[model samples]
Target: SKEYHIDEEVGFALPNPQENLPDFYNDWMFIAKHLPDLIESGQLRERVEKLNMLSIDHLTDHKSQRLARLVLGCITMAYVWGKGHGDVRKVLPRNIAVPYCQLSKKLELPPILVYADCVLANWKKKDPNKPLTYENMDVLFSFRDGDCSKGFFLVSLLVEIAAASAIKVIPTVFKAMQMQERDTLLKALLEIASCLEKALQVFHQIHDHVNPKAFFSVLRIYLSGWKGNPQLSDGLVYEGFWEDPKEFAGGSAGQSSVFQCFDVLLGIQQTAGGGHAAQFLQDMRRYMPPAHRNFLCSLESNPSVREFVLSKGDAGLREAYDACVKALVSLRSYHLQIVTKYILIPASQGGTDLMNFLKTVRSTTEKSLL
Candidate 1:
């Protein structure tokens, strides 16, 4: 790990986990660290300005392909989250950001950008009469892999990762949002519902490869919150990245679900007052960057989307709110199936259900995304 410094003028220079990689990941991290300064140099902008020639198919090996994805993801995150949203933002001038967005569409390089641009990039419908659905929407690239299962799994995780950092980009649209941008909020909620549907689909693809016993005992333990392990420190920590007070006993759900931000924006009563579910969301905030986590926590005192909709008494807004709630309910319902297949049944069967267990897991997640 490396030291992270938060500039008074700019936010923390994020530490790249693959900083020592011997490929484009290292090269990209080198450039990203220079950020706003790189924008002034004109080199980063000029390079990304002509990204139409790039193609993921050209990469032969998985590592190279992964590097290509990382480079593109890094560039997009820097432009959108760093320059477009960060407080000390100065990079990603229109001359660069515009073409970068356009070229990213052309190359279809970063799936994260393609899936999340609607919410993160401030895009809007050109035609006033158009329906705000996934259909009729066309970017330059779809970012689909040849395998449907793999494609859905990859893209769904990207969406959740982007959603986790919603606070970083929320400021860019906060004022417009305050006026009750219910439609935008509803669309975001739907996107998350769709992502959860896709995630469960991923379990079908990996059922045979993963051992049920390992999943229940080892994996669940790894994903669980701090249990005051004397072997390490005595605080709430998730893999040592997020450390909170001992009293804030909670688990990490952000990596597995999209319910946290939805609860904040919609004021959904996900758990009893100060119960384990609420604490789980609080602990998951540690998975996000410090600034974003704090921003989300600050919103507890602010008016939520639910309040705005009720105060206005708009029938359409009310319907949209119900739809969002319904989607969340469906998502949590699907999660129960995962809990059964991956955790409960395997444990009751002595952690080794090879035949019937695999079939049931596959059957449950393979159904329609309803």
Candidate 2:
């Protein structure tokens, strides 16, 4: 009976981000402008087609595939930007107009937001005929109200470009690299770029409402995976994320960036830093009251932490964790700057207010360090 219900759910009425694509609007004119350069120089279309193909292979996990497509969408957008198709600012519309948010509310999507899927879906269906699943609804909400998306596209494109350029600019690294694997390597880089892009696009739409600290936690965790994979670091040195952009035009996925992410983790480590990560422990200790800190720390350390930080069930935990990992790599390398300017500032630099302000507004804000 459970299987029957699940299968029935999967039928025509199934709510999926993918099935709803045609309704989404894309900047076709924008897409049209950069098509040739992306094809000839960056091979954008080819890369996206490969990304889309791989996503199909994992079709059963529509959520993962949808996320993957978002990544590809990022690369496509980046390539579009590289070619200078339109004002990159055009992508970031001013605050959502009241009417648009009303439409979002009518559709049960977050009002006053402009996420990639929401934007794309808007192009496809002015309004869909059926009810969507929680996943689809969550994504739309996630976009409209999270971390600011300043470095979203720029960071994603730069990272991929850096990786791609590393292979091209330095042939020596790939000298031992097998000929058969070159295409696969290229595809992988593009996909990562796409994934990071999706993270940014999602953040861009939601940043206004999403806490910067929470969004960044996922970003740092995501990049940690990249650090574990040494090969991914091949072209990072010259690529500009770590290096000066003017000199090399971009950066490679280098080790220096790893330190940057951890440093950032240390910077924003707090009670709400993605609900509590390793770094958050140290951060709250430095900033909060000792009694409150002890209370938070004991909650996590205690066998039963539910009294302090309630678990969001396995599915919610998994999604939150995934989002945290994605956050580390969200803006490719540039997301690191969030740590420097927005995050790791002296208390005098206006950050102290943020903490006090948060505490004043939300009583549920947990304490997690001493």
Candidate 3:
């Protein structure tokens, strides 16, 4: 189905990116279908690590270029969902880590780049050139390449959502870190609460890709790990294209995300025993990427925001916390509406629910959303 390209100088051999001009739809589906084999045999991770180490002296070959994109998606998912031990070791290999960022620059597609370029830094230029505004987010939706089959938008949306959350939380974290006056943190959280609202509103505008089927199908297989699988005897396996010698189960989106960081820092704990609603929110993290997950985890393990709130008896900080929680709830509420429209309603009627067979996971439509 594909041609192999090898560059001994780079120590990389994979499918020729030139043979397939632009459409990576089939390329991903091909990967998804063969994903189990790739992981079990260790070939996929091996291939990605090689591609990661490929020399960058030149512009890079077509195969390595395209393969790196998919590999980034795989490695990102794996590291994010994979479980951690005490002190959280660096899960991403240097081979995968260095090249992934390189490819993001080379391709100019992953939303992280867009987040840095437009969302975070507001680098996008527009007519009238008004002060940076959410109106400029149209630049993000504009990032389409070769018929929109590469799943860049899907990845971009995930990155942007997490980035929005990070932008909302980080400043307060910094202020709290500095032990600055309580008013600074209070005002920052209150302002960020609203900022989060605007950020998510812009995020919602990230429309579905032209090839939703292809995008979701490939995503489902790639995101699948041990935690959510029903058939696993241990009921715990990590989902990814790489098999760890430690026999760790694959991760889901909920494992480590900025959303989780927000909950922890703000003292918003969604206990598994709390209720179905909480469990659903927790499960939703399976959809997030690894980088964001780790960022959240790193923040939580260090412990700053939550501790700061408790140490200060200031009413204003308390009020800010309440406001932050309300804003977060609003953000999640909007997400629920989207999930209902795009996933639940379709799944109840026997349609594909974002590439997952909903009925297999849910015994009743009434309970699926919970």
Candidate topping TM-score: 3
- Per-residue error (Å), model 1, residue 136: 26
- Tens-place lDDT digits, model 2, residues 1-370: 1121112222111133443223122332233334445533755444433331111332235443333334333332343233332312212111112222223233333211113222222111224553331212322211112222323322322232232322231122122123424444344334433444444543333334334454343222211211223323332221211342111111122212221222222122333444423333343232222222333343333232121113333444333323433444344334443434445542223344434433421222122111
Off by over 4 Å in 2: 1-99, 114-351, 355-370
Q: Write the per-residue lDDT of candidate 1 for residues 121-173, one digit (tens) a residue.
A: 21223353674222322222111112122223333333344343432333432
Error of 2 at 167 (Å): 37
The whole-model C-alpha lDDT of candidate 1 against the native structure comes to 0.39
Q: Put the candidates in lDDT order, highest first.
A: 3, 1, 2
Clashes of each: 0, 35, 16
| Per-model lDDT | 0.39, 0.29, 0.42
Q: Which lDDT tens digits does candidate 3 get at residues 265-327? A: 665555344555455545454333333434445555655565667677767776676666666
What TM-score does each of the candidates earn? Answer: 0.42, 0.21, 0.46
Clashes of 1: 0
